[model samples]
Target: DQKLSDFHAESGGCESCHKDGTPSADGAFEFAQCQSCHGKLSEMDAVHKPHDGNLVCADCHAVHDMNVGQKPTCESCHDDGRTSASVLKK
Candidate 1:
């Protein structure tokens, strides 16, 4: 039988589960539900202008095995130094 600890170890870590927004089935743990809150970019239609499906939550937020601690910075694409300002406004 698979235990919570076993699953955590088999996967990367808590971040592995938390990052994808897949919660434990037993509901014994409390962690941030990433997809529940921030699923598709379409959800932000009211606040954000539409992109050509180019941006995703994982695109900016560092996920488990891929980005880890390295959060994507707007400066990586946008030449302007106004990071938050540009994204928030757009």
Candidate 2:
């Protein structure tokens, strides 16, 4: 009964981006739906190429909370004396 079409439906609840039943493993967001709200990441004002350039928008940003605070810090994923952030600029 919950479609992501209603952005606020899961605001404080179950994350819809869990295609693999876990938080950080996989996602349930349809690529089209993503663009529906944010437009294509590759088409953004700037597209950053990191980690072999294979990472998708959901890879760096937390699709669960779907907010700026949900964006993972550079430290959350990397520890090689480097850091980065998504360009979507919530």
Candidate 3:
């Protein structure tokens, strides 16, 4: 299975998501890179808007584990009646 990191890495290199060909100590730089290309989560859709400042892209994307064409999941932190549409209501 191809990982999201590998998919992006193929587009360029480690610098595709990392800086100086390496990861950041706090992952701040990596998160910044995501916004630069993908734009802010708040500007996207309801499934992403609520995250905004509350979370970074990796919080759900988890590129290291996520595969290409695979959508992120909500079962980790949300349970019961929690849903993407529900997140927008609150």
Top model number, lDDT: 3
List candidate 1 stretches off by more than 4 Å. 1-37, 45-52, 64-72
TM-score of each: 0.38, 0.40, 0.84
- By TM-score, how accurate is candidate 1? 0.38
RMSD of each: 10.3, 7.3, 2.5
lDDT of each: 0.47, 0.45, 0.86
CA lDDT, candidate 1, residue 52:
21
lDDT (tens digit, per residue) of candidate 2 on 4-57? 323433452333333342344243354433556566555554334333236566
RMSD of 2: 7.3
Task: Please give, for residues 1-90, the per-residue lDDT of candidate 3 as tens digits.
Answer: 899999898988999889878999898899999898989988998889878898999998889898887887688987675766566676
Query: Which scores greater on lDDT, model 1 or model 2?
Result: 1
- Candidate order (lDDT): 3, 1, 2
